[PDB]
């Protein structure tokens, strides 16, 4: 089958300044009419992919003049000549000269701006959950950039090694921000057991690392 | 103009699935039909394609889904069916049908998920996170909606009936050591609020039909 190999896999772009994506072809995509069977489409988050250039450089209905593509044969360039936080997302290019249509890797394009630190939010277990039998202590860090942020939980200054699970969120499409939630499992016989549970948040936008807390009971 | 996707879900290993992708506002007959797949956090794969009728309704499989599939097309109904047999594991994946032709051209549906697993379906339990001095810094306020405990994915969360959409984030589902998933989904609002503006997260597990709305109260 003919292999698509995109370059690069992933780049990180300020909005107002260009990218550009590489894709590669193992077999000819050039048309006897001098257009190519090669296309592009943009994964944005939460989404199914869209079109964004067929033919090898035919902008898809709605598709702005800054996304441009070019190239012949088998070396093709995908072009954003000013970024905007809404091309956030995963940039794939297709053959579609012959069956199985393949795909490359998918690039993913990062929205590049300033260090934002996160808001930091601690939820004890609910009353009802407590009621069910289980416990879940829930540390939510909001907005903030880069994705790299480390969480420590700590139950009455004992670090907790293995029952917390995180989720961060797709880079936002309007102000470029991640959020992440921190789940710390405990039974209730655990839970009912100790006082102080707290949430230790370390990111490049805090000086010092923050910690938000709470007493079960309330103290 | 509509694509509607259904017949994915859960589906024991060795089974059978046939997904229908229903077009409205312009006929098939005249369209290829394309089907493609994705795995959770993975790329784009071509699953096979039905061609126009004036190309001889002409059918074409990925090698990697050898002699398991059917695509066909019921004009009467104007739907295309994709017909899956002795499934794996290896086939959960976010199923796309692609319209290639005058209308919705290069444009993909929504999708819908199959999961192939020996685990069975089980609805979720939703706790309220709610707001309080711990999840209050500065003038924001956090709450929230866990959604725990259930098989398989996925869960729609809106609030206030999709008319609280600026400063939601609903978190990536995490698969819990027991096999069952679980996410949160949060909101960040004035805390001036809190005591006036009612907070109701709709949470909907159609797999199971569980459908909750729950109200998020301060304190």
């Known amino acids: 089958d003919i292999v698509m190999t995109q370059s690069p896999l992933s780049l990180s772009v300020t909005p107002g300044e260009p990218a550009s994506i590489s894709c590669r072809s193992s077999?000819?995509?050039?048309?006897?009419?001098?257009?190519?069977?090669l296309e592009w489409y943009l994964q944005k988050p939460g989404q199914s992919p869209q079109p964004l250039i067929y033919?090898?450089?035919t902008r898809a209905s709605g598709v702005p003049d800054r996304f441009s593509g070019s190239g012949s044969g088998t070396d093709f360039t995908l072009k954003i000549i000013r970024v905007e936080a809404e091309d956030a997302g995963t940039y794939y290019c297709m053959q579609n000269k012959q069956t199985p249509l393949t795909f490359g890797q998918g690039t993913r394009l990062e929205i590049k701006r300033t260090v934002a630190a996160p808001s930091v939010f601690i939820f004890p277990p609910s009353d009802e959950q407590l009621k069910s039998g289980t416990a879940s202590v829930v540390c939510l860090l909001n907005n903030f950039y880069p994705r790299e942020a480390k969480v420590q939980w700590k139950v009455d200054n004992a670090l907790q090694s293995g029952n917390s699970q995180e989720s961060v969120t797709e880079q936002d499409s309007k102000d470029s921000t991640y959020s992440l939630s921190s789940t710390l499992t405990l039974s209730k016989a655990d839970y009912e057991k100790h006082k102080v549970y707290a949430c230790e948040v370390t990111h490049q936008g805090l000086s010092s690392p923050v910690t938000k807390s709470f007493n079960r009971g309330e103290c | 103009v509509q694509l509607v996707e259904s017949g994915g879900g859960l589906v024991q290993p060795g089974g059978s699935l046939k997904l229908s992708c229903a077009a409205s506002?312009?006929?098939?007959?005249?369209?290829?039909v394309h089907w493609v797949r994705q795995a959770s956090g993975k790329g784009l794969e071509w699953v096979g394609r039905?061609?126009?009728?004036?190309?001889?309704?002409?059918?074409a499989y990925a090698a990697s889904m050898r002699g398991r599939l059917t695509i066909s097309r019921d004009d009467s109904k104007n739907t295309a069916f994709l017909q899956m047999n002795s499934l794996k594991s290896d086939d959960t994946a976010m199923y796309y049908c692609?319209?290639?032709?005058?209308?919705?051209?290069?444009?993909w549906g929504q999708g819908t998920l199959v999961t192939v697993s020996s685990a069975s379906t089980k609805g979720p339990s939703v706790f309220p996170l709610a707001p309080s001095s711990k999840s209050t810094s500065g003038g924001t306020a956090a709450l929230g909606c866990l959604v725990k405990d259930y098989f398989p994915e996925p869960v729609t969360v809106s609030w206030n009936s999709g008319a609280l959409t600026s400063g939601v984030h609903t978190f990536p589902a995490v698969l819990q050591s027991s096999g069952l998933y679980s996410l949160s989904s949060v909101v960040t609002v004035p805390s001036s609020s809190l005591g006036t503006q009612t907070y109701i997260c709709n949470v909907n597990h159609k797999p199971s039909n569980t459908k909750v709305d729950k109200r998020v109260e301060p304190k």
């Open positions: 506002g312009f006929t098939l007959s005249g369209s290829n």
């Open positions: 033919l090898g450089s």
């Open positions: 692609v319209i290639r032709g005058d209308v919705y051209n290069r444009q």
């Open positions: 077999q000819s995509l050039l048309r006897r009419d001098g257009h190519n069977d």
């Open positions: 039905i061609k126009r009728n004036a190309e001889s309704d002409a059918t």
